[PDB]
Amino acid sequence: MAKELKFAEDARAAMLRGVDKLADTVKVTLGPKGRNVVLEKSYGSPLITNDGVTIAKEIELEDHFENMGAKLVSEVASKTNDIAGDGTTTATVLTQAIVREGLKNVTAGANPLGIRRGIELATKAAVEELHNISTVVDSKEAIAQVAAVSSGSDKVGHLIADAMEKVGNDGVITIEESKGIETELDVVEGMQFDRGYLSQYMVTDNDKMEAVLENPYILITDKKISNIQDILPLLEQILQQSRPLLIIADDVDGEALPTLVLNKIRGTFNVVAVKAPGFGDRRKAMLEDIAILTGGTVITDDLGLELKDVTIENLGNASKVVVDKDNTTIVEGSGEKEAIEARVQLIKNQIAETTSDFDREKLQERLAKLAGGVAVVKVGAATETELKELKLRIEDALNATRAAVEEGMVSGGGTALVNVISKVSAVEAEGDVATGIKIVVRALEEPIRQIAENAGYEGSVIVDKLKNVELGTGFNAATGEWVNMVEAGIVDPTKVTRSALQNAASVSALLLTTEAVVADKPEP
Amino acid sequence: MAKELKFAEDARAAMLRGVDKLADTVKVTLGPKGRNVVLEKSYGSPLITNDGVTIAKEIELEDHFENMGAKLVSEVASKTNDIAGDGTTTATVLTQAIVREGLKNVTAGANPLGIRRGIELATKAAVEELHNISTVVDSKEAIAQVAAVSSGSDKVGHLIADAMEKVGNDGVITIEESKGIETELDVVEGMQFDRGYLSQYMVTDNDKMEAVLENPYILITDKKISNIQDILPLLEQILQQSRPLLIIADDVDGEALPTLVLNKIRGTFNVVAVKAPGFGDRRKAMLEDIAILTGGTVITDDLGLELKDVTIENLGNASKVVVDKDNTTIVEGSGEKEAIEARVQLIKNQIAETTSDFDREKLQERLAKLAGGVAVVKVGAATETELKELKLRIEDALNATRAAVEEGMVSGGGTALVNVISKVSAVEAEGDVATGIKIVVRALEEPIRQIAENAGYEGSVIVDKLKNVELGTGFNAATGEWVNMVEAGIVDPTKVTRSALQNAASVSALLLTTEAVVADKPEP
Amino acid sequence: MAKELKFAEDARAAMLRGVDKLADTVKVTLGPKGRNVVLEKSYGSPLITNDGVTIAKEIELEDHFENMGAKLVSEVASKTNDIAGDGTTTATVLTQAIVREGLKNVTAGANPLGIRRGIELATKAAVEELHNISTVVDSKEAIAQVAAVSSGSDKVGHLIADAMEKVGNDGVITIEESKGIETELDVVEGMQFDRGYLSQYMVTDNDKMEAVLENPYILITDKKISNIQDILPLLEQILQQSRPLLIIADDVDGEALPTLVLNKIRGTFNVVAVKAPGFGDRRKAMLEDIAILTGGTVITDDLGLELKDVTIENLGNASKVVVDKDNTTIVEGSGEKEAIEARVQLIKNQIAETTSDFDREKLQERLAKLAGGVAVVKVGAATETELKELKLRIEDALNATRAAVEEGMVSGGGTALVNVISKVSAVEAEGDVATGIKIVVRALEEPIRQIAENAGYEGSVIVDKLKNVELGTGFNAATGEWVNMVEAGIVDPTKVTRSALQNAASVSALLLTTEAVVADKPEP
């Protein structure tokens, strides 16, 4: 339909207006003393919240180009909200500041390519400095402490520590609702592999986006399922059994996939299909591993098994299966322990025999995935409200604990961002590169200044005082006192800050170089 | 509907406005330092890209005459984007420049026929000069290097070199996804002939526009298939076998073609029908060759075989068949090797016996197609993302390698275009012919000047300096340094540049002679 | 619905505005150096062409009166485009000039009836002069030369010459596509009669408007077919045979005609019904002749044959049947040669015996149709594109050859039109008759002046110089040199020019006498 071709600064002017609208709507919630924002709802009472990501999601502007800006910044925050729950806001603030100042500089010449180069150099230096100064969190006590912060109650610290120790750093930890009143930790045989659902229609938990199956049947095959006729007898058998079905195949497409989607939507079948992990000869390796764990059989042409000949017996079984957008987790497979042990010993022998470091690494991955098991946290509480609150509290606690385990811990409240200003200013450059360096140097003060302003303190005073205090001492927005953030517990994961900075810098660089904007004309 | 007939100059003014809008949207992406353009999408996040052809495709203007200009220039770029991926942009820039300056000159008299004559003469001289100065690429090492540039990784160079040698210059090379982690080259018995699909509805790969069939049945016949009843028993047999079907007939039309199209759309039948290559007595020659290669039988009235009497046995078989818009490729035919060898020997005897150079050439074409085989590149990589990236990287690398093989290699970055300015200026003409010669001379500087401007350098300075430096030395837009393009690897295929220039000149000549524009009046 | 009655001059003013719009859109393509015009299309790329008839067909104006003038002039061009392909444009230019100058003269008095009388007298004198000065084309060598001009390649000249000698001047010549690479001429037994199809729905070749049947069944009967039930058994028999059916009857109407039209549209039956040539006892004469030539039997009440009793055996057969809007052609009838010879001898005896010159002429027509046969030109070429181009080239070459054979050859490029100016000016008249004579004298210069202007030369200078040069020497628009058009090959058929002049004069006379225009009021 009719386009609204626009070039030069006016396109960028509209881009900036949209980004400014979104930033003014979002940034007011930044910091512990953030203020609350009211969002409209079609039905029921309106929702009042200070959660940044929800507000950013709800934003949609009438002006097409401002809508472009809003959607762009929202997609930036999308890459970051996955870890923790605060990295989806700092990125927006940094993007707004960088875009505004860069546009102002570009208006007066200042070849945009030099600005982008300087921004990239400053961001790289800042990331290097952040990885330089950090409290490495690797001790068991520190890991338990981080599991005991955020919400983390107190027991979650020890629970996460023990589960982590039992399954390792990369071991799978699962959270369940115990029917009792006590929260318990269990380690069972399970499999998680990086294969999400083929479609969102078969998601069981819309809020968690995850697909949850309880005591499901598991279909294991290396073949491609493009025809629904190949599985109709098995579908009828499972419908007779009235149990959920998990499908692990090379690919499910064609007419079978829409048919299964329609059946799931209508509730006829509680079926989930995911792609088979691994490729080539490797795929059959952990296909056989899954078959051993679940007690099922891999349906492959090598064994002479056909899809139409698959019965209930050949299907794998497990207590619970969780499928997210990218990974599928199996809990308490029904296969024999001795067979799993024999497979583990075979993989160990292969590792001791293989000479390729790549093949050894793949076999080690299979061995660790098979032998580490799955940590199960059966949360128990007196009331369903208490159980749900504890579940939510444990979820983000585990996420933050893992994030701290991988990268580390740094000063919270944006203090880390200012602490790296000196190193960025130390970067040597000339011309537009130096201009972009100064741009980033100025913009890096935005989070702390905004947090100070939201609490009513003067931002500039806070920035100036922070630039002249000892490293590790920042500003406590809650109390207005200058204390040790590490001692005061105002700590943020290194990964969150660095990811927000990287995303904001990259997207600001992309936007600053935009020259022509193509958008649909509003319909009269 | 109602028309809005418009004549004289302001019609050309509207055409120029449309072309200017399209060029201002496209040309900003020209060159290595091209800037990004944002395109709106109906669903999902907007796409940001610097790919010229996609942006040109997405452009649609509300003004009918400006829409006319946009569609014209887009159809021009259509004839050029087939080879490489950059010739679809320079053509637009040259077209805009020529049209603008020619319109300005025509406004002051300057009989347009003389302008068209001068433009054609200048373009012919420029093409001759481009064919004159060129680094001929025929050595195996140079071919491997050209296959090792663009993306070309490094292994693709040797892989393309070896397949290029094994199948010859015109030999068919195919790219496949190996299930393993290594990319391998294979030469098998195959057949590619210039016969595309009869319709776009049975296209299996929409992105590649190609029709892909895996282990399909092949129907070989010289008869015309206008009735679906003639093939219903065979259709039912193949549906029972649930395999793809390839139809090679003189012509499939009437009611059978829409029926097959509907069946393919509904997914009932994976059938593709193409015309039989060759005509007269010749057609049966490669028909029999295809039957021998695939193990099938040609259904012809000479042999007493009827379409309704065709069984599964008489059908040809192959591992894979690829059908593009214009050609159909057969991979790993199931016919006997000895029969193919006997056919090859028969064709060789015919060649040694035939006295007509035309008939000898046709027999040589058949012999080369039968004996050269098909090069199969089974791409292997660790991940599907890696496999797809490698596949895409190999595709354009092969295309550019072939383009360099046929024509040659010249200086990239538009340096070749400036290098031929002197020869064009040396062409003698008078009056409007000389005016058109000057028009082309002035316009030939547009690509390099635009590239310099996109990188922030002054275009006029770069043009003037380039006109006075030694041949083979140009401007590196990436670094801003005057180096050897051949040594620095800034090289472009001769075919791309010459095709872009020819298309731009022809279309500009057609547009400059326009006198009256008939357009659909907008509905109030 | 509602009318918008308008009288007096503004009605004529709108007539003139519409005619001027159409003329300004068309005339720019006149002459060898014509400029191109852009036409909109609903789907696909817009079509750019300089073909006048297509552009005139595509024009449709919003103003009801201007659409009035456009439709009128288009219907004028309709009567002229049949012969050659250029007479559809000169007529429009002449009409525009005459209408404009006549309207201006009528505005100042000048009783329109006198203007019409003067226009008719001038046109009659011009036609007489054109028939006076002309190069009569009757020699075989000249006929071959004219067959060797236009496109005419070179072989088409001799081919058309030999076919024309073999079949005579009025003999039927047919063009076919040979499966080989060589074009061949064949003379076979055939039949063409002035009876077109009963409706356009059974037209097989939409582009050529002709109905083409290959090896069809021929129904020959003198009865009137108004009931579809009379032919249902034969229809079922032919459907079993799956062959085309040709129906030759007195008249096909009632319910049978819509039923056959629906069957042909649905593709159930490839049936074409045409009226029987001749009337009274004469109709049965060439009905029996067709039966003899095709081997069929005439279904008539005299023989006691009923329509429901017609079998496949009684149907005539031929290799090919071509049915245009006005004539039906039969190729290679299956009847016995001896029976045809006996019929020919009977007709010759009747001719030698008949005493009525009218009856003798009719019998001679039958004899010539039976004995002259049909020339078949089997065009052969290497590629289908070459075959189609050669077919199109032969078509117009044959048309122009016939046109020159009947009338003759005169100077092309409008030189003949100026060459007759003196004779028209020599016509004596007074008052408005003399005014119309001057009108035609002035308007006759329009084509040459327009052609000169399109090539950039001053029209008035060309006209003045042409009026003072020797007869037979005109202006070559391609080169701008005054050469002998006959020697230079710039020759146009006499029939085309005279027909264009007659049509333009007649329609201009009709329009100049208009006083009231009733038009449909635009819907608000």
TrEMBL record, chains A, B, C:
It is found in: Cytoplasm. The keyword Transferase does not apply. InterPro entries: Chaperonin_Cpn60_CS, Cpn60/GroEL, Cpn60/GroEL/TCP-1, GroEL-like_apical_dom_sf, GROEL-like_equatorial_sf, TCP-1-like_intermed_sf. The keyword Nucleotide-binding applies. Its EC number is 5.6.1.7. Belongs to the chaperonin (HSP60) family. This is Chaperonin GroEL. It comes from Enterococcus faecium (Streptococcus faecium). The lineage of its organism: Bacteria, Bacillati, Bacillota, Bacilli, Lactobacillales.
